[PDB]
Symmetry: D2
Subunit: 185 residues, 4 copies
């Protein structure tokens, strides 16, 4: 009976999106974004913690002047389930007024919290607000919200990796995998 | 006479560390850290915003269970320049007590800020605190502080890219470059 | 020649609003607010740090069920002076949606930051947003904004005390005084 | 039958410490503190939200130069029930190094949170750290901690008022009362 050190791959049912697929797509989106933001320096924002790996790869493949920033938010309880209103833990380091804001996200599902942030930025007089998401789960929507750039449309699979976690782990996987039912059931 | 949109490359005097060099070193360091933390899930933390690109790539090449978190800090004025004490704007999302902390940094120069945080984590009863930095400028130290893992030891260059900025721009370059004198003086 | 320890009163040229006046006005305002909010538990919010002494005394003389909360904000520089847009350092502990918000302030001058907060709460779907200020300098307005409750309308005086500071000192005076010119110039 | 508008007093079993007692004590503590901090300008800190009414009254009865500041913290869960380690939501606006810190609190019960903050300030190189608390429940201690100034020693009563809440309400009472079992049972 061979026993060895636990590896994350042992918890993965299958690879939904490979690292190779991801890099191919990041290269595509970054080129499109560079073209679309040619003239101005936008503020590319990521909401911690999920967006980090994608935002990092995407922006280095986006050949244009831009500024990066980040926000941290937390839930107010069941009221973060109605309008998506969240508690701001860390706001942007610079003002939104007159800026072209690009929100970089790992996945859009219910669309609630991203919807709340987009309109908060429009309230703060952003010149524009657009969203680029690596993954999109359209059947999950609880409010209408269409991302401006989408890497992949995914079905209702329990996904982890490339920013996506299960109990704060797995975010470091270089691919998006489907977690075996055993691990979370 | 022909004009057109500006490109970041025009502002770079030379490439100090190529994207290929960074990737080779990230692979190397990822493997070493995975080996060192194979029997425990450490808390890998990055201090916004410079550490992101490196933290993303490094953790992707570190095949072990681990948790990610982030801190945001700001200067208290000259009392930060003289001692490292910084104002915490976003604290860790989880407790430090009993955890193995791994601080991921882009560059260590004076070492003041990092030293303040290291001893803050020790005050909070961390089990261990280690530091991995992509770049190390040992001649700049104002306090004794040696990184546990170092990608590159750099000389006296004005650098930008791969997280390093000049007036908040250039962090998205996929390499570490030397900025032309004209741009900052 | 006799010297001794310094006393704050030495720095005050004249009492503008005495402790006796403030207390009489707080009693009056607290009774009005209690009547206006008798059938609802409003969320009374103070923006740190100036509003504290007034908010403590006001709410104590307001005999009705209510909840207290506080926000902390900082300036974005020359982008907070022409919009009022400020950086949120500490957001409310509870959601704004559907709540009657009562902002307690020490003084309204330009009305910029307060106007930004009011419309922020309306963006957050507050049921109502009202403002009670101990002092009002209407001649300083940079935006149209009238408080719903005002203790005293003040002229063009350099004031300190009862929350108002000069270099973070004097906030503990139990009255509002005019600072001797010597101290600030 | 006779039904009237709900008043907070209807939820109060009895008044444990009256407004009259509170003011008499604040006057005493304020005079002692002004004497103890005669020569220096201490940084008087309050942890939101409970400390507000007391800090407000106490500091205005403290006739000495001082700076006020505030912190906001949140629990990490069960790990905040061992060392008292908490998540910092709002840190001090100024540095602690070399400052005489005076923590103003409404009540010390387990002593966990305050013990963590006191030693955090000593870690940040405060010149001194002392505590003034309105109420003290010494039998509640889970860690050793004696306040330097204490208004009243209270037994194990479910208290509300003068900053103390029950479901975020009652903080505005101008006295400290014992809540009727009915209300919380
Ligand atoms: Na651009
Ligand atoms: Na591990
Ligand atoms: Na009410
Ligand atoms: Na003093």
């Amino acid at each position: 009976y061979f026993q060895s050190n636990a590896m994350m791959n042992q918890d993965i049912e299958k690879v939904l999106i490979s690292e190779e697929q991801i890099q191919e797509k990041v290269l595509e989106l970054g080129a499109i974004i560079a073209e679309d933001y040619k003239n101005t320096v936008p503020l590319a924002i990521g909401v911690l913690k999920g967006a980090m790996p994608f935002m990092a790869d995407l922006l280095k493949r986006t050949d244009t002047y831009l500024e990066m920033d980040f926000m941290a938010v937390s839930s107010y309880g069941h009221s973060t389930v109605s309008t998506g209103e969240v508690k701001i833990l860390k706001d942007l380091d610079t003002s939104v007024e007159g800026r072209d804001i690009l929100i970089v996200e790992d996945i859009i599902d219910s669309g609630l919290t991203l919807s709340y942030l987009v309109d908060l930025f429009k309230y703060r007089k952003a010149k524009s607000v657009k969203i680029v998401t690596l993954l999109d789960k359209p059947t999950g929507r609880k409010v209408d919200l269409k991302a401006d750039y989408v890497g992949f449309t995914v079905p209702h699979e329990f996904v982890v990796g490339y920013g996506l976690d299960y109990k704060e782990q797995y975010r470091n996987l270089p691919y998006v995998g489907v977690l075996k039912p055993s691990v979370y059931s």
